[PDB]
Amino acid sequence: AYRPSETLCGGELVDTLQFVCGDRGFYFSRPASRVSRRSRGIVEECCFRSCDLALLETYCATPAKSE
Numbered sequence: 001a002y003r004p005s006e007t008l009c010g011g012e013l014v015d016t017l018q019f020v021c022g023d024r025g026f027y028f029s030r031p032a033s034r035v036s037r038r039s040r041g042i043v044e045e046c047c048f049r050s051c052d053l054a055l056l057e058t059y060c061a062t063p064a065k066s067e
Contacts (some may be wrong), residue, residue: 002019002020002033002053003051005051005053005065007046007047007050007051008046008047008050008051009043009046009047010043010047013042013043013046013047013051013056016041016046016053016056017042017056017059017060019056019059020056020057020059021056021057021059022054022059022060022062024060024061024062024066025060025061025064026042026056026059026060026061027059027061027064028042028059029041029042030058030059040055041060
């Protein structure tokens with residue numbers, strides 16, 4: 001189900017990852033990536049850019065302290 005495309009900001013966009021990351025939790029602060037420099041991080045993108053969704057999908061954290 002979910003929604004179409006939207007934009008949500010700091011705290012509010014936590015809900016995006018909250019729905020796509022899921023049972024593991026997301027990290028927000030992605031480390032480096034494969035572009036030899038840094039990469040995007042939360043809020044500047046759903047708050048300042050757009051919520052590309054796939055983003056939030058990848059913001060999730062499987063190797064997280066399970067509960």
